[PDB]
Amino acid sequence: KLKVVATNSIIADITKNIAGDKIDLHSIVPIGQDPHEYEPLPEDVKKTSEADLIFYNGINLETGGNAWFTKLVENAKKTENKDYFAVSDGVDVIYLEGQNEKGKEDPHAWLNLENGIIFAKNIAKQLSAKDPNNKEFYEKNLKEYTDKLDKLDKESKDKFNKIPAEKKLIVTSEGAFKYFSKAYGVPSAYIWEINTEEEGTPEQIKTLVEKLRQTKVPSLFVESSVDDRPMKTVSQDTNIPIYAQIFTNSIAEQGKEGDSYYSMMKYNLDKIAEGLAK
């Protein structure tokens, strides 16, 4: 079987939906862990050395700070666009502070389903190139999977489009939902920007509170992977309830709600459409 390495649970789950039992798959960042500053363990080093195909997010998810993915592939002697591939190739990239330059890409592309589809298409392309005997199988799985994501995308867009515009704001701790905002027409507000060293200061909280007092947003949200005390303070100060915990950069543990890329996005989209229609 083709030996495949995925850098996180989202990419691994999309890969499973395309490849089924045709591959030997290993994931690096486990469910619920952080890709930023992740430290690969010996099993990751050995699996990456042995891999026929490696999928990573790209757009600065795993290559900033400690740049763990760069170190991994260089030590494994793996080559870009031969052995390893960025599944985000083709996304309409968003840049931090709207400054188009290398290293300022916002990595959170998968938080809209159009980009999850692009991820799946890139994964199917490279599986087919390395394992042509299973090309038709990968293509069939791809079409079924992208149809499923597209149906959820269209249904969710129709729900957001009906909400009174004054209610439409996605409020989270970190500004990690800009791709979600672009696709779904729901502007973002947040406590701290991506790549902020000091998270949840009294000053950051007060500035979001003052913004939210001039809106009619009916619900706030909080990421399941962040310390919720800053958003709980924003909620207390605005008297706007936190409607739900939402997923950001991982699927859920197996057997729980949100334990796949599809179900993680369905959960997020269902909770945010419900919470903003309140």
DSSP notation for 7-71: SSHHHHHHHHHHHGGGEEEEESSPTT--STT----HHHHHHHHH-SEEEE--TTSSSSTT-HHHH
Q: How many CA atoms lie within 13 A of 97 on its CB side?
A: 9
Helix (H) or strand (E) holding 221, with range, is: strand 220-223
Paired with 23 in beta bridges are 2
Q: Give, to the nearest 10 degrees, the angle between helix 42-50 and helix 68-75.
A: 50
Experimental method: X-ray
Return d(Cα 199, Cα 207) in angstroms, integer. Answer: 13
Q: What is the CATH number of domain 148-278?
A: 3.40.50.1980
Query: How many residues are present in the chain?
Result: 278
Paired with 80 in beta bridges are 84
Paired with 240 in beta bridges are none
Contact 223, 245 (CB under 8 A): yes
Return d(Cα 148, Cα 5) in angstroms, integer. Answer: 24
Helix (H) or strand (E) holding 234, with range, is: helix 229-238
Return d(Cα 244, Cα 173) in angstroms, integer. Answer: 13
Return d(Cα 94, Cα 96) in angstroms, integer. Answer: 7
Resolution of this PDB entry, in A?
1.5
Q: Which CATH architecture has domain 1-147?
A: 3-Layer(aba) Sandwich (3.40)
Paired with 26 in beta bridges are 5
143 is written with which tokens? 């079409």
Return d(Cα 63, Cα 73) in angstroms, integer. Answer: 11
Please list the residue range(s) of the chain that carry CATH number 3.40.50.1980.
1-147, 148-278
Return d(Cα 110, Cα 176) in angstroms, integer. Answer: 11
Buried b (16+ CB within 10 A) or exposed e, 75-89: ebebeeeebbbbbbe
41 is written with which tokens? 């363990």
